[PDB]
Amino acid sequence: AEEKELVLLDFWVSPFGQRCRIAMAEKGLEFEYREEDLGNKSDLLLRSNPVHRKIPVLLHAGRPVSESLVILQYLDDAFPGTPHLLPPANSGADAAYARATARFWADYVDRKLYDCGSRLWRLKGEPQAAAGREMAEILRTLEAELGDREFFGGGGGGRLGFVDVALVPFTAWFYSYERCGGFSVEEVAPRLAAWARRCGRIDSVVKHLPSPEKVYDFVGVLKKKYGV
Amino acid sequence: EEKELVLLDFWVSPFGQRCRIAMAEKGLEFEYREEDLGNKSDLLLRSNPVHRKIPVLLHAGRPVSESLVILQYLDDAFPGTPHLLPPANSDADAAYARATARFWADYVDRKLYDCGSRLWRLKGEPQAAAGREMAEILRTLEAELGDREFFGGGGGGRLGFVDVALVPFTAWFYSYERCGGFSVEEVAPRLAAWARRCGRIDSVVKHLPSPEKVYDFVGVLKKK
Numbered sequence: 001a002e003e004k005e006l007v008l009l010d011f012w013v014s015p016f017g018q019r020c021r022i023a024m025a026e027k028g029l030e031f032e033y034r035e036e037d038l039g040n041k042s043d044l045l046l047r048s049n050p051v052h053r054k055i056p057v058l059l060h061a062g063r064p065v066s067e068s069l070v071i072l073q074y075l076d077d078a079f080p081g082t083p084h085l086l087p088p089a090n091s092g093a094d095a096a097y098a099r100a101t102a103r104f105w106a107d108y109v110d111r112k113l114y115d116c117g118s119r120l121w122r123l124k125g126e127p128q129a130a131a132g133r134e135m136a137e138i139l140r141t142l143e144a145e146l147g148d149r150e151f152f153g154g155g156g157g158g159r160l161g162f163v164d165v166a167l168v169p170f171t172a173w174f175y176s177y178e179r180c181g182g183f184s185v186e187e188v189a190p191r192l193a194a195w196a197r198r199c200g201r202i203d204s205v206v207k208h209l210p211s212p213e214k215v216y217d218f219v220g221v222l223k224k225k226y227g228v
Numbered sequence: 229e230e231k232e233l234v235l236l237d238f239w240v241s242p243f244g245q246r247c248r249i250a251m252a253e254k255g256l257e258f259e260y261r262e263e264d265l266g267n268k269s270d271l272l273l274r275s276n277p278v279h280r281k282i283p284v285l286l287h288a289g290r291p292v293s294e295s296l297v298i299l300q301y302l303d304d305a306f307p308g309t310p311h312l313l314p315p316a317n318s319d320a321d322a323a324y325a326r327a328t329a330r331f332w333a334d335y336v337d338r339k340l341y342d343c344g345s346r347l348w349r350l351k352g353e354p355q356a357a358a359g360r361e362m363a364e365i366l367r368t369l370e371a372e373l374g375d376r377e378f379f380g381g382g383g384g385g386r387l388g389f390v391d392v393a394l395v396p397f398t399a400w401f402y403s404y405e406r407c408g409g410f411s412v413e414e415v416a417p418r419l420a421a422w423a424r425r426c427g428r429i430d431s432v433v434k435h436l437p438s439p440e441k442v443y444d445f446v447g448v449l450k451k452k
């Protein structure tokens with residue numbers, strides 16, 4: 001008799017499923033994690049997300065919610081007593097505008113990180129370097145939005161907000177972006193690097209993110225799984 | 229910035245048309261400004277510097293971009309007006325209904341625009357292929373609507389989040405049919421029916437062009 005029967009269909013190295021893991025951890029919500037083999041998807045995943053057949057999928061008392069950013073908003077809507085990722089406009093202030101800004105930047109993460117990152121290990125030579133330059137600029141753009149704040153959330157909450165959660169799993173890929181793209185996050189976007197180190201000390205993030213070296217090793221298998 | 233709301237837009241954009249419809253549904257007046265996409269205004273470049281795309285909604289000079297974002301902003305910022313998404317804490321299944329609505333609106337964004345463009349862009353068996361895929365997409369939206377009057381709640385009798393997201397694309401159905409070799413009536417009749425019902429609603433009459441005008445525009449796109 002707690003809050004919820006939560007189950008998460010996921011894949012260990014997924015940045016998208018990691019979002020939902022961190023958000024539940026942040027919220028004190030316990031869940032059953034089920035590892036899926038994406039080459040051998042389970043009947044339950046295929047039934048629970050028939051449209052996309054992707055993880056993560058969150059099942060709350062047997063009813064599925066797909067798409068990581070949708071699950072994140074759900075975790076606020078469905079559990080109003082837990083610390084919120086987006087400010088409730090249920091208190092007015094500049095809440096409405098702050099929510100819109102947060103959705104814009106989470107959307108921007110969804111549009112840029114995964115796809116643009118993947119080019120870094122799918123391409124080689126100059127095309128790879130060019131993809132690296134675009135990655136650096138994406139990180140500079142994130143940096144610019146963070147400005148002088150401790151977190152993307154705005155703010156003074158001292159904890160992870162919606163955008164922070166959306167972006168933080170990719171901090172585990174920064175190393176891989178560095179080696180493949182030919183730049184250093186520290187040089188290109190020092191304040192984003194500092195943000196990644198701050199986030200990296202937070203228990204939810206420590207728990208749910210793999211190390212940069214483990215991700216680099218996975219990128220290694222991906223780099224083979226495409227050309228040969 | 230004469231009235232509170234200024235919408236930077238492009239006349240035939242289905243994404244801007246969502247915002248126009250949403251405001252009309254909410255009783256919110258706004259100033260409409262046409263952007264020349266080959267000559268973007270300084271105001272647009274400054275307000276959406278990240279993507280440089282319309283629509284942009286400026287509420288008392290503050291920009292909100294991304295059409296689905298704007299729709300949610302219009303509920304959040306104007307809580308007294310008719311809602312596109314049911315309020316989470318104000319059925320008691322609101323949380324789940326909202327997630328379902330966001331899921332489907334995302335589906336429209338991920339499929340309609342992109343699958344549709346291919347239909348006029350390409351010209352042969354690839355065009356045909358695009359055709360095939362659009363038909364399954366419209367079929368999938370049909371199955372989510374099921375026997376309901378609107379994608380939104382129901383009992384209420386008005387457009388919700390997903391209706392408004394998708395409705396402008398109903399003006400493009402004729403063009404998809406022509407370009408991709410299929411019939412909406414054959415592949416998704418209940419969806420065709422939904423489109424007709426929405427087409428009697430004041431906001432939709434006002435802000436959507438006719439299918440023929442969309443098709444002519446498609447023809448202008450091709451010639452170029």
Ligand SMILES: N[C@@H](CCC(=O)N[C@@H](CS)C(=O)NCC(=O)O)C(=O)O
Pocket residue numbers: 011014015016017038053054055056066067068069
């Ligand atoms: N829009 C998504 C994408 C999630 C996604 O890309 N999942 C990958 C794993 S990282 C997947 O399940 N696709 C399955 C496949 O490769 O067949 C979300 O935000 O959750």
Ligand SMILES: N[C@H](CCC(=O)N[C@@H](CS)C(=O)NCC(=O)O)C(=O)O
Pocket residue numbers: 111112115116117134135137138
């Ligand atoms: N519509 C897509 C957009 C692709 C995109 O997001 N490009 C990334 C690299 S993967 C980028 O850095 N774009 C320019 C920017 O975000 O400033 C396309 O043109 O193919």
Ligand SMILES: N[C@H](CCC(=O)N[C@@H](CS)C(=O)NCC(=O)O)C(=O)O
Pocket residue numbers: 238241242243265280281282283293294295296
């Ligand atoms: N993410 C979308 C995209 C809006 C969009 O695609 N805008 C197009 C016009 S329909 C645009 O502004 N393109 C600018 C250009 O062509 O440079 C939204 O929902 O608002």
Ligand SMILES: [Cl-]
Pocket residue numbers: none
């Ligand atoms: Cl693995």
Ligand SMILES: [Cl-]
Pocket residue numbers: 042043044045
């Ligand atoms: Cl199963």
Ligand SMILES: [Cl-]
Pocket residue numbers: 003078079080081082
């Ligand atoms: Cl709660």
Ligand SMILES: [Cl-]
Pocket residue numbers: 122123124125127128
């Ligand atoms: Cl290459």
Ligand SMILES: [Cl-]
Pocket residue numbers: 149150151152153154155156157158
């Ligand atoms: Cl902060």
Ligand SMILES: [Cl-]
Pocket residue numbers: 182183184185187188
């Ligand atoms: Cl560097």
Ligand SMILES: [Cl-]
Pocket residue numbers: 268280
């Ligand atoms: Cl431009």
Ligand SMILES: [Cl-]
Pocket residue numbers: 050
């Ligand atoms: Cl299906």
Ligand SMILES: [Cl-]
Pocket residue numbers: 376377378379380381382383
């Ligand atoms: Cl209904």
Ligand SMILES: [Mg+2]
Pocket residue numbers: 137
């Ligand atoms: Mg750029």
Ligand SMILES: [Mg+2]
Pocket residue numbers: 140188
């Ligand atoms: Mg700099």
